[PDB]
Design a protein around this ligand. Sequence first.
Ligand SMILES: *[C@@H]1O[C@H](CO)[C@@H](O)[C@H](O)[C@H]1NC(C)=O
Ligand SMILES: *[C@@H]1O[C@H](CO)[C@@H](O)[C@H](O)[C@H]1NC(C)=O
Ligand SMILES: *[C@@H]1O[C@H](CO)[C@@H](O)[C@H](O)[C@H]1NC(C)=O
Ligand SMILES: *[C@@H]1O[C@H](CO)[C@@H](O)[C@H](O)[C@H]1NC(C)=O
Ligand SMILES: *[C@@H]1O[C@H](CO)[C@@H](O)[C@H](O)[C@H]1NC(C)=O
Ligand SMILES: *[C@@H]1O[C@H](CO)[C@@H](O)[C@H](O)[C@H]1NC(C)=O
Ligand SMILES: *[C@@H]1O[C@H](CO)[C@@H](O)[C@H](O)[C@H]1NC(C)=O
Ligand SMILES: CC(=O)OCC[N+](C)(C)C
Ligand SMILES: CC(=O)OCC[N+](C)(C)C
Lengths: 135, 134, 286, 45, 96, 48, 93
Amino acid sequence: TDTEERLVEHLLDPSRYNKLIRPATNGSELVTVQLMVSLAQLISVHEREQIMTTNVWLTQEWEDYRLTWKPEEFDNMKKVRLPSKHIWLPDVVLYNNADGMYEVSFYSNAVVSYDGSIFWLPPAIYKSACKIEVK
Amino acid sequence: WKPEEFDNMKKVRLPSKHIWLPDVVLYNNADGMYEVSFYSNAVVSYDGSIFWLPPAIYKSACKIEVKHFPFDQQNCTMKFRSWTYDRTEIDLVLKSEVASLDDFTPSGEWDIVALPGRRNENPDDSTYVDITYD
Amino acid sequence: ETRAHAEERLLKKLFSGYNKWSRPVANISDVVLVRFGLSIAQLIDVDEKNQMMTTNVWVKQEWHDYKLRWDPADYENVTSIRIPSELIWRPDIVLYNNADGDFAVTHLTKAHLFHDGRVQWTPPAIYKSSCSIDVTFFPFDQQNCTMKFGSWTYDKAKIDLVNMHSRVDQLDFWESGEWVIVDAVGTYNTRKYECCAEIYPDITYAFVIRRLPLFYTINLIIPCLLISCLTVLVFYLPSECGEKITLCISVLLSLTVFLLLITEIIPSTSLVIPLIGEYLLFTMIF
Amino acid sequence: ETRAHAEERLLKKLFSGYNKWSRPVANISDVVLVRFGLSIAQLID
Amino acid sequence: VLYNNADGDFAVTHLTKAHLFHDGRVQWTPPAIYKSSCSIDVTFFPFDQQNCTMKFGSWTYDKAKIDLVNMHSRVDQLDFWESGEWVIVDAVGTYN
Amino acid sequence: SECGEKITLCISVLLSLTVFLLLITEIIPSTSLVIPLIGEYLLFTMIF
Amino acid sequence: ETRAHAEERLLKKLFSGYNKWSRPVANISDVVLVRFGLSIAQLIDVDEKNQMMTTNVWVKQEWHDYKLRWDPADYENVTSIRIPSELIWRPDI
Ligand SMILES: *[C@@H]1O[C@H](CO)[C@@H](O)[C@H](O)[C@H]1NC(C)=O
Ligand SMILES: *[C@@H]1O[C@H](CO)[C@@H](O)[C@H](O)[C@H]1NC(C)=O
Ligand SMILES: *[C@@H]1O[C@H](CO)[C@@H](O)[C@H](O)[C@H]1NC(C)=O
Ligand SMILES: *[C@@H]1O[C@H](CO)[C@@H](O)[C@H](O)[C@H]1NC(C)=O
Ligand SMILES: *[C@@H]1O[C@H](CO)[C@@H](O)[C@H](O)[C@H]1NC(C)=O
Ligand SMILES: *[C@@H]1O[C@H](CO)[C@@H](O)[C@H](O)[C@H]1NC(C)=O
Ligand SMILES: *[C@@H]1O[C@H](CO)[C@@H](O)[C@H](O)[C@H]1NC(C)=O
Ligand SMILES: CC(=O)OCC[N+](C)(C)C
Ligand SMILES: CC(=O)OCC[N+](C)(C)C
């Protein structure tokens, strides 16, 4: 729709939204990020290599006050889908990974509510190192 | 540039990705990697001389001779060409007749015998030029 | 008058104020109907040990975009053009059961755009999916590996999938000689996830493949049977010959080797045991 | 005068309004004849 | 693109510089490492003679928009590097 | 028969042939449309 | 007023005329001191046959940029920021 395209252009307008800046408000505050790992499948557990491969969905939720809008002015739209690569993201990564791949596999869209709430649920194939007990 | 107009600066470092490069590559590579591995800076003198020394990990195809294994001697070659410009555009020249071993780490399994370099032209083509190190 | 001028003229008009981050519907309540279909090019690998299936498919997609419309009479009677797929909005159809592969389409060939807004996109893809492997009747086994496709961020109220055709196209399938597709049908499903309060549709394709049991019969079964035939001869061998122990020891050490060779083919799953594994083990015990 | 300046001018002219997404054919009915051939460098495996 | 690709790349990924002439002619000769599937016949192994094919064609342009012209029929071998394990009996391209 | 080595010889031949068949199996494709003549010869020899 | 606004103003000011291809020294005769260190994460492998060591390290680097200075009092007391490493000059270690 025209209204949705207008809203998307308005929100991500680089003249007013810089994705390199943390959405900190009220001063020197911190942004609370909620995590939730959803295990979709345990692909394999190599014992010789000591690597566990998993297919997980890494739920991530935070509040970005710079992506707020009034539903009345935008045809009562309550949430819109934005590309995750064009908004500020907390660079949450698998720190103990094996194979040296830290970020998610797909980079899906981020579902943004009108009140600034963000919801990002990217899938990922993760190869994590772990200590195998052979006794 | 004129050094006197730039605080008597004689040479500066410019990124090699933002200046014209002769696309010299390892033509006979065996893994599909033609270019160098780093793309470092190029040291540019005030007279326009460019000095580029990028490192590279190369995988060249070799004709292994097995008749005298394990007392065999291999003759592996590395052929360098510019995969963009022909001889009518750029002329390749050898800075030295042999490869340099100034910073070489001895192998332990293989003993280096000779590393000559030769510049080859094709008398029938006139657009072909390469430098091969044996 | 000319195409490379008219088509260029058309291309400029279409991508003047085009936004690729917005669902292409003239009305918010409308649904983007994506006709989804698969055309298998070949079955690259059916790895049983890793329980993964590698396939080469053409991910046929088709949807209507209301901004990419024009009147052919105005543009020298141009009815359709080829446009880059990275400049237009596309559905985010991902393979749910991806194992050691890419979730979405990563090649982005050109799309065919028709004057009424229809967009046909048929990118090729190599998908490495995970499928349960049942080797009870190996090498006469018949596997059933599935691929689940669906939109990742749009629910049924925004994007809905339509079965292009029930069966996976096989006109250009490449026969390998090891596997034969018995049937491959896509089934439309809808379900609710704990993530989100909306219904997310999906299309699951079930590839029922049958192995041709003449290689492993020639190379594993018959050699196994021949050794099993020597199991009983030790009892007809006279003791004075002094070769009884040599015969039965050799038989045991041969059957043991065959069991390990099979152990390296079948998956390490502990739900079912192959009939070949049972037979070898019982012969080893006897 | 130098060849480099002439080439820069030519490149500026050619790509002023060039659209790479459009088929390069003078006319609607035209077909892009793409001459195709393969040169084999080595049969790796 | 290569139709019968197997685990490799569908299209060229090196994208060298194209030679453009003043009459509009364009010559583009990039390199490629192709992994094409082919049926293996081992009836007479090790004295076998394989017949492996590579299928090339435009992915999105039909015959009414892009037509392929067979420059030469046989594959050019002037720069071929001898494998030492296989010998190319005959490599001919057929337009279909 | 008095040498007491017939069983050793024949068993060794059988297992050597089986090992060579298994070695061949690691080279040829796992296809069921054609069978190598080397494989057929080895299998007939093992049966006999 | 909000910290995000101050950070945006600071980012606009810093990269106004910044060049990432130039050594960040106020004087040519100066030398860029790059405090260098390693922090091994795991010794992935020690390949004896191929004679290679695979390690997972954090390449801790630290230098001084004279053109990336600001007064926190003028930017709502912003003391530090995180910027993509590809927007600034880096040592080519
Ligand atoms: C294109 O070709 C057709 C048929 O040859 C002709 O009728 C038409 O006038 C041509 N258009 C231009 C712009 O030359
Ligand atoms: C969108 O569709 C709904 C339901 O059909 C309708 O009530 C509404 O008026 C439509 N919007 C516009 C702008 O026509
Ligand atoms: C336009 O082209 C279609 C086929 O693409 C043809 O059937 C039709 O007659 C043409 N009309 C005109 C006015 O050229
Ligand atoms: C194949 O699997 C699917 C889902 O796992 C099932 O619905 C279908 O009945 C199976 N088909 C056969 C022939 O086993
Ligand atoms: C090789 O295969 C192609 C297509 O399968 C066929 O046209 C050709 O005749 C074959 N050549 C030989 C020598 O078998
Ligand atoms: C840079 O340092 C040198 C040596 O300390 C000094 O002579 C020169 O004046 C300095 N440059 C400036 C602009 O102060
Ligand atoms: C600025 O922040 C620092 C801590 O980051 C704090 O110690 C200091 O008091 C603050 N100053 C003002 C004026 O807010
Ligand atoms: C909203 C969103 O990203 O959902 C992802 C998970 N899925 C496909 C089960 C709904
Ligand atoms: C239009 C389009 O992309 O078609 C792709 C299918 N193929 C390669 C068989 C023509």
